[PDB]
Amino acid sequence: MQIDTLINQLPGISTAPKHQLEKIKKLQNSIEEKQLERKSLESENEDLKLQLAKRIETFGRLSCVLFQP
């Protein structure tokens, strides 16, 4: 009887794999388009963030002059 409940629990109750693959098509339509953006982010980020951190580095170095007058 539990098996019957297990029958209820079986994934893809809609039993429409042909539609499921289409769902996966929509998933590509989402994910794959997301990928270029999400990858573009780091390029839009760290590429400048390094240099800006270096700009912090300059002031950090010049602090030492005051530290040792």
């Binding site: 002031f59 602090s63 005051l66 007058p69």
Partner: protein
């Protein structure tokens, strides 16, 4: 403390050209005896004096200078 103005109060107590001054000074010397021990309370020497203290104040005088630099950059 007491070593300071105690001298100030003992200082005016001298009176009469006559050798009666001791009658006053006996009151003084006992305090001075206490001073000999009060001085023991002040048996310390960190900084020398001037000009080393002045060098300290000047040391801050340079050390306070940056405060009107990078902090200004913060603004």
């Amino acid at each position: 403390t007491l070593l300071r103005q105690g001298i100030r109060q003992l200082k005016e107590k001298v009176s009469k050209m006559e050798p009666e001054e001791m009658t006053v000074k006996e009151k003084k010397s006992i305090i001075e005896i206490l001073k000999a021990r009060i001085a023991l309370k002040k048996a310390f020497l960190k900084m020398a004096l001037s000009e080393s203290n002045d060098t300290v104040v000047k040391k801050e005088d340079v050390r306070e200078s940056p405060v009107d630099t990078f902090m200004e950059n913060a603004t």
